[PDB]
Amino acid sequence: PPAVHLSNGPGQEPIAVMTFDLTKITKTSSSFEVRTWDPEGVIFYGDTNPKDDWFMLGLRDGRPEIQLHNHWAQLTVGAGPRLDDGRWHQVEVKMEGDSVLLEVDGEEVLRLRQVSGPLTSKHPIMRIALGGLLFPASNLRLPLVPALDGCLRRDSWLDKQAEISASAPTSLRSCD
Amino acid sequence: PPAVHLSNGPGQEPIAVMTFDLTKITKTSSSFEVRTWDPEGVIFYGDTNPKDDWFMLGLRDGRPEIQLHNHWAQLTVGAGPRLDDGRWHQVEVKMEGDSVLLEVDGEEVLRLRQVSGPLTSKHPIMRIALGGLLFPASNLRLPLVPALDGCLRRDSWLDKQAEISASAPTSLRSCD
Ligand SMILES: C[C@]12CC[C@H](O)C[C@@H]1CC[C@@H]1[C@@H]2CC[C@]2(C)[C@H](O)CC[C@@H]12
Ligand SMILES: C[C@]12CC[C@H](O)C[C@@H]1CC[C@@H]1[C@@H]2CC[C@]2(C)[C@H](O)CC[C@@H]12
Ligand SMILES: [Ca+2]
Ligand SMILES: [Ca+2]
Ligand SMILES: [Zn+2]
Ligand SMILES: [Zn+2]
């Protein structure tokens, strides 16, 4: 399976940004495998508005951390086992009703309830950035250093049929 | 080890309530072992004010759930493995800086960050209720049925030297 580097050297910007049409979304889940020895960094960021409608999934002290900021909730939460053990880990992030669910290696490790209304409704465009944020780290509810020295593979983001475009500030590097 | 029943039949009220002097608190952690086959219910509730300063640790679909409502945060979060497997489980809830940490069987499974300022400061009295709430379940951010058919043992609550009093609406029942 082709795996890409989650950061390009300095690691101050995402390695890729995908834009989606929310009205066209039929699938809200995202999944991928990640491998790393890095205990802190951004795995992926998502927003409909960088100002007041955003989400971040990363690692802090080796464990998953989600920061979320929207009309219904504002939170900084850590959960799950350490993932900075150099092994491949399966990760899934999905919407289940008004909740955001995080599954690690097939097991649910965190369910953030009552945090969102329907995506398609309410913010017609959603952006997903890998390995970086779309705003300064200092703007996070709880700052961390975004650079994540790890590998990503077998990734699936939301609904491909709803993807408007994809960019890369530079060029994706292989973990081979 | 003497174990007590976490609910008395109907299970509409706590089996015990302990009151503490916050200014006297030197230890903020609580720990205990719980065993149960019940997938939903309140393990313990805590507040400094039932109106706007409260906390609840329970089970929903077999897994730990924390609801918290205070000046800094308002949340409903599920985490950790199922605990309704009839085995004894060690549980710890503690303050670590501005965070509330939940450990299950020796492993950190959830860290709610940026949710509280110093306890001793800011609410001079804290109440801890076991197996029930100190307000209607309908008043929870996300209602659940409080009755938890399980056993509790080896419990330690905050700082005993700060305990003002303890009550029991009825009488503690043994799991023997
Ligand atoms: C987590 C998820 C959904 C599952 C999907 O796999 C990834 C996206 C990323 C953006 C989140 C959204 C959930 C709703 C959020 C928190 C708000 O609307 C602001 C940003 C949004
Ligand atoms: C969780 C803990 C601390 C660890 C201890 O072991 C149990 C107590 C229960 C009451 C919580 C408090 C944390 C601060 C809370 C959320 C707010 O002040 C309102 C109720 C309070
Ligand atoms: Ca890093
Ligand atoms: Ca029950
Ligand atoms: Zn919005
Ligand atoms: Zn208060």
UniProtKB/Swiss-Prot annotation, chains A, B:
Q: Which stretches make up the Laminin G-like domain?
A: 4-175
The subcellular localization recorded is: Secreted
> Could you say which tissues express the protein in this record?
Isoform 1 and isoform 2 are present in liver and testis.
Report which superkingdom the organism of origin falls in.
Eukaryota
Intrachain disulfide bonds: C151-C175
Assembly, in brief, is: Homodimer.
Known role: Functions as an androgen transport protein, but may also be involved in receptor mediated processes. Each dimer binds one molecule of steroid. Specific for 5-alpha-dihydrotestosterone, testosterone, and 17-beta-estradiol. Regulates the plasma metabolic clearance rate of steroid hormones by controlling their plasma concentration.
Q: What is this protein called?
A: Sex hormone-binding globulin
Organism lineage: Eukaryota, Metazoa, Chordata, Craniata, Vertebrata
Q: What is the name of the gene encoding this protein?
A: SHBG
- Please specify the portion of the entire protein covered by the chain, as first and last position out of its full length: 42 to 218 of 402
